[PDB]
Design an enzyme around this catalytic site. Sequence first.
Site, short mmCIF file in Angstrom:
data_model
loop_
_atom_site.label_atom_id
_atom_site.label_comp_id
_atom_site.label_asym_id
_atom_site.label_seq_id
_atom_site.Cartn_x
_atom_site.Cartn_y
_atom_site.Cartn_z
CG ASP A 25 42.32 4.76 -0.31
OD1 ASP A 25 42.95 4.35 0.70
OD2 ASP A 25 42.67 4.56 -1.49
CB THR A 26 42.97 5.80 5.65
OG1 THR A 26 43.34 4.39 5.50
CG2 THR A 26 41.59 5.86 6.29
N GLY A 27 44.60 5.59 2.70
CA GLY A 27 45.88 5.55 2.04
C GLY A 27 46.09 6.52 0.93
C1 LIG Z 1 49.39 2.77 -2.80
C2 LIG Z 1 48.89 3.87 -1.84
C3 LIG Z 1 50.08 4.54 -1.10
C4 LIG Z 1 48.20 5.01 -2.64
N1 LIG Z 1 46.94 4.61 -3.29
C5 LIG Z 1 45.72 4.40 -2.52
C6 LIG Z 1 45.52 2.89 -2.25
O1 LIG Z 1 44.51 2.80 -1.22
C7 LIG Z 1 45.06 2.13 -3.52
C8 LIG Z 1 43.60 2.50 -3.95
C9 LIG Z 1 43.21 1.64 -5.15
C10 LIG Z 1 43.82 1.86 -6.40
C11 LIG Z 1 43.47 1.07 -7.53
C12 LIG Z 1 42.50 0.03 -7.42
C13 LIG Z 1 41.90 -0.17 -6.17
C14 LIG Z 1 42.25 0.62 -5.05
N2 LIG Z 1 45.03 0.69 -3.13
C15 LIG Z 1 45.98 -0.15 -3.60
O2 LIG Z 1 46.91 0.14 -4.30
O3 LIG Z 1 45.78 -1.43 -3.16
C16 LIG Z 1 46.59 -2.46 -3.79
C17 LIG Z 1 46.10 -2.72 -5.22
C18 LIG Z 1 45.07 -3.87 -5.15
C19 LIG Z 1 43.59 -3.49 -5.44
C20 LIG Z 1 43.14 -2.89 -4.10
O4 LIG Z 1 43.82 -3.63 -3.11
C21 LIG Z 1 44.98 -4.33 -3.66
C22 LIG Z 1 46.27 -3.76 -3.00
S1 LIG Z 1 46.77 5.10 -4.87
O5 LIG Z 1 47.98 4.70 -5.60
O6 LIG Z 1 45.44 4.67 -5.33
C23 LIG Z 1 46.81 6.88 -4.89
C24 LIG Z 1 47.98 7.52 -5.26
C25 LIG Z 1 48.00 8.92 -5.28
C26 LIG Z 1 46.83 9.63 -4.93
C27 LIG Z 1 46.88 11.14 -4.97
O7 LIG Z 1 47.16 11.62 -3.67
C28 LIG Z 1 45.67 8.95 -4.57
C29 LIG Z 1 45.63 7.55 -4.54
#
Ligand SMILES: CC(C)CN(C[C@@H](O)[C@H](Cc1ccccc1)NC(=O)O[C@@H]1C[C@@H]2CCO[C@@H]2C1)S(=O)(=O)c1ccc(CO)cc1
EC number: 3.4.23.16
Lengths: 99, 99
Positions: A25-27
């Site tokens: 996860d690059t995000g």
């Molecule tokens: C919103 C981003 C800026 C930060 N996220 C990483 C994303 O790739 C985050 C990873 C994730 C989280 C929960 C369930 C599935 C995947 N995808 C995300 O929200 O995607 C959204 C939610 C939906 C399910 C996946 O794709 C759809 C769009 S995160 O909130 O998980 C996160 C926050 C803080 C930390 C600590 O640094 C790690 C990850």
Amino acid sequence: PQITLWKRPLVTIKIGGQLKEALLDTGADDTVIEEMSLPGRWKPKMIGGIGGFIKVRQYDQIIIEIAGHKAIGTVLVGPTPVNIIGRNLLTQIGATLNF
Amino acid sequence: PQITLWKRPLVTIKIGGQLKEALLDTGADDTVIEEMSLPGRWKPKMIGGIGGFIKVRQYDQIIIEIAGHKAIGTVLVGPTPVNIIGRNLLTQIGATLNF
Ligand SMILES: CC(C)CN(C[C@@H](O)[C@H](Cc1ccccc1)NC(=O)O[C@@H]1C[C@@H]2CCO[C@@H]2C1)S(=O)(=O)c1ccc(CO)cc1
Ligand SMILES: [Cl-]
Ligand SMILES: [Cl-]
Ligand SMILES: [Cl-]
Ligand code: NA
Ligand code: NA
């Protein structure tokens, strides 16, 4: 390898003696794993994203094997819906996004 | 490009004639942008992020430029900490993960 993004980029990881699946996860700034025990000290942290924040345990200097590649770094542990390999460990295995 | 992950992979996008910053997010299935006006009709959608589920507005077939690459696809509008470019559009610009 070259992983396409037609599907979730899930890989096998080994952490704390356990094999799990996790998302590359690059995000994600940091790596977040579903509740498990890990050895050593930890400290509490709150991390947030879509839907708000969760409380996690921050463990430092933890080794993970990611798709066969060893990395060490911080791992956050808490009620995440999915195991997430974040940038703090992706950098250590030399991962890049290419287009 | 070849984007390393020591920093957040932030890029410029262009939507509705406006430049915005967004995060290339391989952990997101979908593209989620902060409140803005978009043309046409929208449909309801629930997405589950790290902290829980939220409602968003789903707009299909939206023209969006991402780091200079043209995409036309689904954009979700709702409260996200940062604009995120998910796999639905990362695939359109040809992005892969490599290590
Ligand atoms: C919103 C981003 C800026 C930060 N996220 C990483 C994303 O790739 C985050 C990873 C994730 C989280 C929960 C369930 C599935 C995947 N995808 C995300 O929200 O995607 C959204 C939610 C939906 C399910 C996946 O794709 C759809 C769009 S995160 O909130 O998980 C996160 C926050 C803080 C930390 C600590 O640094 C790690 C990850
Ligand atoms: Cl680290
Ligand atoms: Cl490097
Ligand atoms: Cl799409
Ligand atoms: Na430690
Ligand atoms: Na539309």
